[PDB]
Design an enzyme around this catalytic site. Structure first.
Site, PDB file in Angstrom:
ATOM      1  N   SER A  17       2.883  -5.220 -14.291  1.00 41.40           N
ATOM      2  CA  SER A  17       3.539  -6.496 -14.469  1.00 41.40           C
ATOM      3  C   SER A  17       3.680  -6.800 -12.812  1.00 41.40           C
ATOM      4  O   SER A  17       4.603  -6.269 -12.062  1.00 41.40           O
ATOM      5  CB  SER A  17       5.020  -6.246 -14.935  1.00 41.40           C
ATOM      6  OG  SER A  17       5.657  -5.296 -14.428  1.00 41.40           O
ATOM      7  N   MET A  36       7.191  -3.787  -9.439  1.00 43.28           N
ATOM      8  CA  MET A  36       6.259  -3.826 -10.382  1.00 43.28           C
ATOM      9  C   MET A  36       6.692  -2.646 -11.379  1.00 43.28           C
ATOM     10  O   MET A  36       7.066  -1.480 -10.714  1.00 43.28           O
ATOM     11  CB  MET A  36       4.890  -3.860  -9.663  1.00 43.28           C
ATOM     12  CG  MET A  36       3.938  -3.159 -10.687  1.00 43.28           C
ATOM     13  SD  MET A  36       2.363  -2.827  -9.376  1.00 43.28           S
ATOM     14  CE  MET A  36       2.265  -4.760  -8.776  1.00 43.28           C
ATOM     15  N   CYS A  37       6.278  -2.812 -12.569  1.00 46.71           N
ATOM     16  CA  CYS A  37       6.668  -1.732 -13.480  1.00 46.71           C
ATOM     17  C   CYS A  37       5.375  -1.620 -14.213  1.00 46.71           C
ATOM     18  O   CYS A  37       4.308  -2.435 -14.329  1.00 46.71           O
ATOM     19  CB  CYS A  37       7.681  -2.098 -14.394  1.00 46.71           C
ATOM     20  SG  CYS A  37       7.299  -2.972 -15.855  1.00 46.71           S
ATOM     21  N   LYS A  38       5.231  -0.515 -14.616  1.00 48.33           N
ATOM     22  CA  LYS A  38       3.903  -0.061 -15.732  1.00 48.33           C
ATOM     23  C   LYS A  38       4.113  -0.485 -17.000  1.00 48.33           C
ATOM     24  O   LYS A  38       5.487  -0.202 -17.682  1.00 48.33           O
ATOM     25  CB  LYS A  38       3.650   1.470 -15.626  1.00 48.33           C
ATOM     26  CG  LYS A  38       2.185   1.639 -16.196  1.00 48.33           C
ATOM     27  CD  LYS A  38       1.769   2.944 -16.053  1.00 48.33           C
ATOM     28  CE  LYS A  38       2.451   4.055 -17.090  1.00 48.33           C
ATOM     29  NZ  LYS A  38       2.010   5.184 -16.823  1.00 48.33           N
ATOM     30  N   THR A  54       8.054   0.832 -18.325  1.00 46.38           N
ATOM     31  CA  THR A  54       8.586   2.138 -17.750  1.00 46.38           C
ATOM     32  C   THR A  54       9.098   1.561 -16.435  1.00 46.38           C
ATOM     33  O   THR A  54       8.576   0.794 -15.678  1.00 46.38           O
ATOM     34  CB  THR A  54       7.949   3.393 -17.358  1.00 46.38           C
ATOM     35  OG1 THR A  54       6.447   2.903 -16.731  1.00 46.38           O
ATOM     36  CG2 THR A  54       7.572   4.041 -18.812  1.00 46.38           C
TER      37      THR A  54
END
Length: 154
Positions: A17, A36-38, A54
């Site tokens: 994201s 930023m997240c996965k 996550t």
């Protein structure tokens, strides 16, 4: 507006994201704080999608899963939020599958009816300049002012 000829199977897998815009101040500030997240996109039993995100808190990788139910045309979904007593429309507006997706979410029922959010998904953690510009222009087309637009750092 939905991505024409949307191929759900090519949309599966790992995404990051990389930016968002929203009319909710607190969501922008919190997501900014998280970075930023996965996200991992997998097919759900109902023909829609499981979106697993996550993020790090302290010494821990927390996992959250959202069920995106099919809403009647390919590339559009509905998400029901029990904690917010609300349902949201989620659309994959544009994607090339291999580099980016532009998503648009709005409340459709409950107190969160007024909510709106544009999201940038990238296949890599370092989106190119051109994709950041695409996203800014996408947000602008969706009525978001530049002050509500946030790029999430890796």
């Amino acid at each position: 507006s939905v991505q024409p000829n949307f191929q759900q199977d090519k949309f599966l897998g790992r995404w990051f994201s990389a930016g968002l815009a929203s009319n909710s101040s607190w969501l922008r500030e919190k997501k900014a704080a998280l970075s930023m997240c996965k996200s991992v996109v997998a097919p759900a039993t109902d023909g829609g999608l499981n979106l697993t995100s996550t993020f790090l808190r302290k010494n821990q990788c927390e996992t959250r899963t959202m069920l995106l139910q099919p809403a009647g045309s390919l590339g559009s979904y509905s998400y029901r939020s029990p904690h917010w007593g609300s349902t949201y429309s989620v659309s994959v507006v544009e994607t090339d599958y291999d580099q980016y997706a532009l998503l648009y979410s709005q409340g459709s029922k409950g107190p969160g009816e007024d909510f709106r959010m544009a999201t940038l998904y990238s296949r890599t953690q370092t989106p190119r300049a051109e994709l950041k510009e695409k996203f800014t222009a996408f947000c602008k087309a969706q009525g978001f002012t530049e002050d509500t637009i946030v790029f999430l750092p890796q």
